[PDB]
Amino acid sequence: EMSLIMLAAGNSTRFNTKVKKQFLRLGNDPLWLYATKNLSSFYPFKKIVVTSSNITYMKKFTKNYEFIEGGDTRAESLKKALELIDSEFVMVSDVARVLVSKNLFDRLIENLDKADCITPALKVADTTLFDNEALQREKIKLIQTPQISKTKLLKKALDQNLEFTDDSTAIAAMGGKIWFVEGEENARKLTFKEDLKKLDLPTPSFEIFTGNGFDVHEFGENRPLLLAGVQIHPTMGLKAHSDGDVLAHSLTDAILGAAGLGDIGELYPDTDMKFKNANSMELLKQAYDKVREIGFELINIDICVMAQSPKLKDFKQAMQSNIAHTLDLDEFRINVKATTTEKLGFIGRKEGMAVLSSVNLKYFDWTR
């Protein structure tokens, strides 16, 4: 009997960009789940645990695994996770190590009894420099994952010290015995931008996601009217909680809703007002930065500004242009339309204005 831990928590700008690597799309599945799915196919684990910096989101993708909140470091994470494990044995692995082959798994498990922790390793044939200083290459081992370990010893191995980079050194530094099985190129750890092209990773699925956004604001506030952060009119201002950009909030909602990241108020509520100031376009940027973190990319934006006045004709290239700049996309993907309601309803009576945004999101093309 043996359980599995997938360590998928933390986050750092090594690989990273604006997009977390556990959230890269390989097929329909995000990396973290792709990896967990792959390992989980190999063996009936008594329990599967996944460490996370994003439990609530992660959870919306499956019901199969127990999720435990990550720690400050890999070991910290792993300790926390082990406390949920009662099987005699445990197999721990990095999600970043996506394409671990069944072959290698069989090699690990066929040596289950020889020592206290079992590990893939590879030799090094190149001149190795530790700090611009030569090292005897034959004595080097590159250590991979998964690693199978006796639960009881691993829990104890991490009672005090939490600086260990892998299970093997942890078990080792407590007197335990280590068994080195030959590793493989498929077990590489996705750490740098450059690594992506070095792995036979499935390119992301072609699904496109839609989002809508609707927002209303009351007229009659003596300040400038800002839409997509372009100044439309010096006094015909909107009675808002921020700088009053109905366009920008409408669009924000649409971008969020497409990513299943709620709506604008779940992020930037009217109750707390460090948002009193609020440059809405910046709030929009930040909204998109969240969508980008979970592996999404805007295809296009279509906006429809419902307002009886003022005539937004002259300002429409300026609005499209500013969105493009803020959200960092080519100008052609942005389109701002406008319409009166022919004097009908609150919009037509001039009580306020509304904006209707429409968006499509694709999964980030990580093939550069």
Ligand X SMILES: Nc1ccn([C@@H]2O[C@H](COP(=O)(O)O)[C@@H](O)[C@H]2O)c(=O)n1
DSSP letters along 290-317, please? HHHHTTEEEEEEEEEEE-SSS--GGGHH
Query: Applying CB under 8 A, which of residues 178, 227, 230, 236 lies at the interface with a copy of itself?
Result: 178
Q: In the chain, which residues are last before a break of more than 2.5 Å from C to the next N?
A: none
Query: Applying CB under 6 A, which of residues 94, 116, 167, 245 lies at the interface with ligand X?
Result: 94
Q: Which stretch binds a copy of itself (CB under 8 A): 42-50, 82-90, 153-161, 296-304?
A: 296-304
Query: Applying CB under 6 A, which of residues 307, 354, 355, 359 lies at the interface with ligand GPP?
Result: 354
Q: What whole-number distance in Å separates Cα of residue 247 and Cα of residue 229?
A: 9
Q: What whole-number distance in Å separates Cα of residue 14 and Cα of residue 17?
A: 8
Would you count residue 218 as binding ligand GPP (CB under 6 A)? no
* Residue list 208-267, contact with Zn ion (CB under 5 A): 215, 249
- Residue 257, classed as helix, strand or coil, is helix
Using the Cα atoms of residue 41, residue 8, residue 131 and residue 167 in order, give the sign of their dihedral: negative
* Residue list 345-364, contact with a copy of itself (CB under 8 A): 345-348, 351-352, 354, 356-360, 362
State in Å, rounded, how far the first CA of the chain is from the last one: 42
41 annotated binding-site participant: no
Q: Which does 276 bind (CB under 5 to 8 A by kind): a copy of itself, Zn ion, ligand GPP, none?
A: none
265 annotated binding-site participant: yes
Would you count residue 336 as binding ligand GPP (CB under 6 A)? no
Q: What whole-number distance in Å separates Cα of residue 227 and Cα of residue 231?
A: 7
Taking the complex as a whole, the smallest distance from the CB of residue 206 to ligand X amounts, in Å, to 26
**Residue (10 or 224) nearer to ligand X, CB:** 10
What angle in degrees, to the nearest 10, is found between the helix axes of 316-327 and 280-293? 50
Query: Which residue in this structure is represented by tokens 């669009």?
Result: 251
**Residue (215 or 293) nearer to Zn ion, CB:** 215
Query: Applying CB under 8 A, which of residues 84, 112, 135, 273 lies at the interface with a copy of itself?
Result: 135
Nearest to ligand X by Cβ — which residue? Answer: 265
Read off the tokens for 323: 């969105």
Would you count residue 279 as binding ligand GPP (CB under 6 A)? no
Residues within the annotated binding site for a divalent metal cation? 215, 217, 249
